[PDB]
Design a protein around this ligand. Structure first.
Ligand SMILES: COc1ccccc1-c1ccncc1C(=O)Nc1nnc(OCc2ccc(Cl)cc2)s1
Length: 739
């Protein structure tokens, strides 16, 4: 029975699955897919190692709930990078059968309407908003499927509560129409202890497996000795050519024509511990594919930030580093190079662990102490689950390097297990949930309000709702007639997907901005769409004051109209208040975005502001999301003179462009530099680019360099000719299917 052809499956999807290598399932997937009425709608909650092909069952169930019972489906993923990878994977897997798959990730939204879509690959943040939109207009009959990758995220997380709110709201809808399902829910999780609780909460069937196609050997390293998980010595390591012996371990891994993952606790540590192995691989291997590696170097060299000095020293030896400091393009290039075997040693941080699927033969975790704290058991499991490539390696090795006292934390990580899932639900999450149900009209009376809380994970794990209702009533989010009805502010909060806690100050700030606005720059329209400071960078006070001393004769007008000062503007803090700190740290943040929408090169922004390019890109993505939310908030409040101003800044921040390119960047392959060089040559509209001379745009893309040197997000590397051919084809499709 274990064969993808025996199971009912489209021929096109079957032949696409044979391309990636999936031709015979495992026993665990069959036992999970044949777990009673799961194929009919009984929700499904299952656990498996990430290397065991967890998502195959989810994709099969989607194809089912989409083909047989034609309806929409949601694929909720934890992060934007993995969500985009899954969106492109599902697109390449489902294009032939005609299932329109599009993504709601970060700032990007599908050009086509959600009604035209058939699968929405969403982040946790945007899937909740999508379901809120479906409930408001009441199009909840379109939804028939919801898939939640990384179900364990529903516990303690900054975006996990939105996951719980996503399901307890759906279940109520299914359990209020009952006065094998109407909306199926399929969840993928890790080896959680209380998975059962989660399975019973969602009524889902529970499937737990521990099968790993490639066996895993986790071990600790103390001094020169290697011990297994159960405090048993397994090997006496002796360095081959050593000048921790981290480099010797990497050398031993490399000698057998394999690759290695090296998880370091910081960025500078990754850059240092990739330089070191590069130096030894030169000296130890030169007594002093290439072509593919030179292609990778050239791909990295035609980027807005260009080549990196440490990357330049490391990469032409098989060794490199992959941390959050690099741009998303550089990170994807390095990840692709490692995935193809071109890069053999990858010094990465913990951020990779939870990101893309990047398996390595040996995973060396330098220290059990990550960022001054012991490594998380979930983080450790995520790292060591990458040890072993399926279908290539016979085994996989994880080596955690510990010493002295550190040995204790290492053995604790070796013998530890995942903590149980939580609920995280007065509190902001419960306020959000109460507002979501009341404003959607799904629940009106307080008896219904407690009935809703009887459907949440808190009720399954085993007052607050009254406090939440009181808070929403006292803050004019909700009116009482005691039937609770949404107000205009309460409806606008649920529409623009913002926390009701933040929406109060957002309302005050926008209302103050309407009274006095500065239209002679884009800084006032940016201070409103600037999310916060958070921790996106470590602000240098002197640098800030210097920039401020050199602002146009019109910026400081915007600075003083929003709350910034000069007596406290990188002044007092220069030689050394919770709101003024949040204003200046928002002013600086709004200055950086000012250079992002002014098309300033990332390296120049880094030099003038001191923030690296990864932080700048993260900030611009967050600001674009916030701009979209603020635009919807003003749209639903009847603020036509502010929504009109904000309607373009989401795109101008997503792509970091000027207004002129806002039509060119609609093309998927025109980010902010293949559109500026294509705009200077006379193409200023997606109309002029549909018939743009093919060979002409090839020449233009060949010029202006900061074979497949051009790198495209989701398309990896593209040759100039193929790149601009796809550019003109995308322009043709955009202008042809939008009218
Ligand atoms: C405020 O909405 C944003 C808009 C731009 C960019 C980011 C956000 C955002 C930010 C932070 N958290 C969440 C969101 C979010 O996506 N909320 C959404 N609500 N509705 C959407 O459209 C989906 C949709 C539309 C029509 C139908 Cl019939 C069905 C579904 S998206």
């Amino acid at each position: 029975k274990l064969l993808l052809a025996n199971w009912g499956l489209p021929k096109a999807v079957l032949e696409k699955y044979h391309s990636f290598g999936v031709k015979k399932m495992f026993e665990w997937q069959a036992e999970c897919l044949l777990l009673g009425q799961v194929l009919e709608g009984k929700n499904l909650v299952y656990s498996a190692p990430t290397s065991a092909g967890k998502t195959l069952v989810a994709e099969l169930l989607i194809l089912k709930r989409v083909l047989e019972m034609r309806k929409k489906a949601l694929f909720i993923l934890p992060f934007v990078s993995v969500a985009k990878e899954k969106k492109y994977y599902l697109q390449s897997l489902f294009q032939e059968v005609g299932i329109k798959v599009d993504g709601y990730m970060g700032s990007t939204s599908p050009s086509r309407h959600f009604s035209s879509l058939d699968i929405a690959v969403c982040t946790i943040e945007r899937a909740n908003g999508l379901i809120n939109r479906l409930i408001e207009e009441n199009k909840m009959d379109l939804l028939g499927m919801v898939v939640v990758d990384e179900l364990h995220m529903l516990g303690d997380s900054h975006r996990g509560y939105l996951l719980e709110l996503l399901l307890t709201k759906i279940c109520y809808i299914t359990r209020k129409s009952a006065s094998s399902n109407a909306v199926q829910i399929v969840g993928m999780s890790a080896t959680l202890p209380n998975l059962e609780l989660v399975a019973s909460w969602l009524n889902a069937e529970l499937y737990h497996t521990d099968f790993r196609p490639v066996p895993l050997l986790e071990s600790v390293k103390v001094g020169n000795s290697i011990y297994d998980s159960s405090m048993k010595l397994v090997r006496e390591f002796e360095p081959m050519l050593q000048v921790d012996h981290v480099v010797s371990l990497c050398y031993e891994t490399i000698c057998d024509n394999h690759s290695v993952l090296l998880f370091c606790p910081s960025k500078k540590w990754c850059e240092k511990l990739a330089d070191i192995i590069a130096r030894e691989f030169y000296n130890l291997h030169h007594q002093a594919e290439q072509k593919e590696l030179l292609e990778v170097m050239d791909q990295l060299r035609r980027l807005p930030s260009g080549l990196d000095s440490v990357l330049q020293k490391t990469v032409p030896w098989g060794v490199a580093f992959h941390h959050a400091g690099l741009t998303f393009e550089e990170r994807d290039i390095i990840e692709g190079a490692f995935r193809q075997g071109l890069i053999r040693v990858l010094a990465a941080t913990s951020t990779l662990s939870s990101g893309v699927n990047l398996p390595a033969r040996r995973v060396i975790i330098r220290t059990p102490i990550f960022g001054g704290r012991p490594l998380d058991i979930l983080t450790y499991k995520q790292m060591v689950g990458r040890a072993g490539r399926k279908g290539v390696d016979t085994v996989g090795e994880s080596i955690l390097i510990c010493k002295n006292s550190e040995k204790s934390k290492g053995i604790a990580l070796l013998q530890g297990s995942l903590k149980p899932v939580r609920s995280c639900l007065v509190t902001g999450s419960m306020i959000r949930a109460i507002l979501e149900i009341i404003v959607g009209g799904v629940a009106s009376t307080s008896q219904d309000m407690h009935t809703y809380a009887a459907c949440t994970f808190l009720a399954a794990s085993m007052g607050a709702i009254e406090a939440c209702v009181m808070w929403l009533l006292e803050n004019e989010f909700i009116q009482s007639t005691k039937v609770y009805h949404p107000t205009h502010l309460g409806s606008a909060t649920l529409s623009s997907s913002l926390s009701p806690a933040d929406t109060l100050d957002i309302f005050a700030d926008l209302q103050r901005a309407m009274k006095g606005f500065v239209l002679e720059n884009d800084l006032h329209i940016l201070y409103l769409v600037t999310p916060m400071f958070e921790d996106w960078t470590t602000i240098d006070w002197y640098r800030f004051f210097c920039l401020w001393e050199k602002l146009p004769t019109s910026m400081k007008r915007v600075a003083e109209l929003v709350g910034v000062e000069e007596g406290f503007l990188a002044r007092c803090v220069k030689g050394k208040q919770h709101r003024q700190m949040a204003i200046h740290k928002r002013f600086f943040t709004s200055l950086v975005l000012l250079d992002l929408i002014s098309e300033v090169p990332l390296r120049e922004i880094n030099q003038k502001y001191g923030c690296n390019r990864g932080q700048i890109q993260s900030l611009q993505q967050s600001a674009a999301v916030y701009a979209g939310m603020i635009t919807v908030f003003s749209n639903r409040l009847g603020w036509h003179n502010m929504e009109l101003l904000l309607s373009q800044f989401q795109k101008r921040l997503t792509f970091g462009i000027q207004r002129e390119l806002c039509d060119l960047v609609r093309v998927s392959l025109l980010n902010a530099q293949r559109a500026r060089v294509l705009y200077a040559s006379g193409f200023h509209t997606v109309a002029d680019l549909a018939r743009a001379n093919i060979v002409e745009v090839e020449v233009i893309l060949k010029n202006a360099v900061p074979m497949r040197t051009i790198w495209v997000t989701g398309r990896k590397g593209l040759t100039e000719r193929e790149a601009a051919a796809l550019i003109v084809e995308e322009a043709r499709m955009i202008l042809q299917q939008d009218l």
